[PDB]
Chains A and B, each alone.
Chain A
Amino acid sequence: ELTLDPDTANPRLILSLDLKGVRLGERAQDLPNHPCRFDTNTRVLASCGFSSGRHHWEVEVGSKDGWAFGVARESVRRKGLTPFTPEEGVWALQLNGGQYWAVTSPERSPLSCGHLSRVRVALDLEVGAVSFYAVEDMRHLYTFRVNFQERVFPLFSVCSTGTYLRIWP
């Protein structure tokens, strides 16, 4: 039921026709520059955000470096180059330098989780947590415990070609 929101998408991203998938293109599309659009960081949000309750979705991930995904607070900064950090309201996993990371700050946390293909995200706004699990055995990857203070959106980022993220039906 989640779909990517094209009005938020950085113009270099290419969204799938069914709005489930995202990869990085080779040029910027000519798109209107709405306040909601990430104009520099290679990000896109889902069209649905959450202010309460518990929510699950699953994300199919490419094998090559370049992606990061999780959740963002609605007030995440959209304009100019911004850090990809929890302080900026991004709580995410990332594949970079051949390693899986939970994107903590100032140092990321390397995950010795083995190869990932699909990840379940469990967002719990009632207790204040977002957790990630590898779907094959639901092994726990990481949990951020956060007193979320605003609406929270699923977040996706792809900053190199050769990889992808896809919301799974």
Chain B
Amino acid sequence: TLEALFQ
């Protein structure tokens, strides 16, 4: 979710 914002 938000946890892949910095991918």
Query: A residues touching B (Cβ–Cβ < 8 Å)?
Result: 40-43, 65-66, 68, 81, 84, 94, 96-97, 157, 159-160
Residues of chain B lying within 8 A (CB to CB) of residue A68? 4, 7
Q: Annotate B1-7 by CB proximity to A: 1 below 8 A, 0 otherwise.
A: 1011111
Query: B residues touching A (Cβ–Cβ < 8 Å)?
Result: 1, 3-7
Query: Do the beta carbons of B7 and A65 come within 8 Å of each other?
Result: no
B1 and chain A: residue at smallest CB distance: A97
Secondary structure class of chain A's binding surface, majority of residues: loop
- The 8 Å CB contact of B4, one of A43, A81, A94, is A94
- The 8 Å CB contact of B3, one of A41, A65, A81, A84, is A65
A104 to chain B minimum Cβ distance, whole angstroms, is 14
B4 to chain A minimum Cβ distance, whole angstroms, is 5
Complex Cα distance, B4 from A157, in Å, reads: 10
A85 and chain B: residue at smallest CB distance: B7
Query: Do the beta carbons of A41 and B4 come within 8 Å of each other?
Result: no
16 examples of A-B residue contacts, CB within 8 angstroms: A40-B6, A42-B7, A43-B7, A65-B3, A66-B3, A66-B4, A68-B7, A81-B5, A94-B4, A96-B3, A96-B7, A97-B1, A157-B7, A159-B3, A159-B7, A160-B3
Complex A-B, nearest 4 residue pairs according to Cβ-Cβ distance, in ascending order: A84-B7, A96-B4, A159-B6, A159-B7
Residues of chain B lying within 8 A (CB to CB) of residue A157? 7
Known: A41-B6, A81-B5, A159-B5. 16 other contacts (CB 8 A): A42-B6, A42-B7, A43-B7, A66-B3, A68-B4, A81-B6, A84-B4, A84-B7, A94-B4, A94-B7, A96-B3, A96-B4, A97-B1, A157-B7, A159-B4, A160-B4
